[PDB]
């Protein structure tokens, strides 16, 4: 099963539901599908989706966890988005 996360600028990101549950905010919004983010732009939300696949893949992983690259010019946006999304 897949879910769709929609950024402020209208991009649609379709990710695995299990991956989207990495964010506590998305998990609470789905619990009872689509989720709308009127204040998160696509260049931020796309990075969040990459973290979703990265976090799930390397959870309980025998091999060493690689570094997650974060460009400086988006670090503060990503930190606020991550705190809002709770992941």
């Amino acid at each position: 099963m897949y879910v769709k996360l929609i950024s402020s600028d209208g991009h649609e990101f379709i990710v695995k539901r299990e991956h989207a549950l990495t964010s506590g905010t998305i998990k609470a919004m789905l619990s009872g599908n689509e989720v709308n983010f009127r204040e998160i732009p696509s260049h931020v939300l796309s990075k969040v989706c990459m973290y979703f696949t990265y976090k799930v893949r390397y959870t309980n992983s025998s091999t060493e966890i690689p570094e997650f690259p974060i460009a400086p010019e988006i670090a503060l946006e990503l930190l606020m988005a991550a705190n809002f999304l709770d992941c």
Binding site: H11, F13, T53, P66
Partner: protein, 93 residues
Amino acid sequence: MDVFLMIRRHKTTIFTDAKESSTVFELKRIVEGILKRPPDEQRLYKDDQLLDDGKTLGECGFTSQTARPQAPATVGLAFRFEALCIEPFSSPP
């Protein structure tokens, strides 16, 4: 071994994983299960290059060392006939 990809139409981006031994047609079946369009109406590209239905992902140039969860590879998508178009993401400014 798995490859992590981004299947991108105009403003739709699909995050999914597959095996490099898997074929392009199998990937089109995955897109069919999400966007509800049969494989015979899709068109998968590698950044400018048409992907044959019979070729595998590894034979297309996708390697597990270049399609990682933190940096997934990009596959273009076109529906039937249409020109391949992927609108870019927003800019930091």
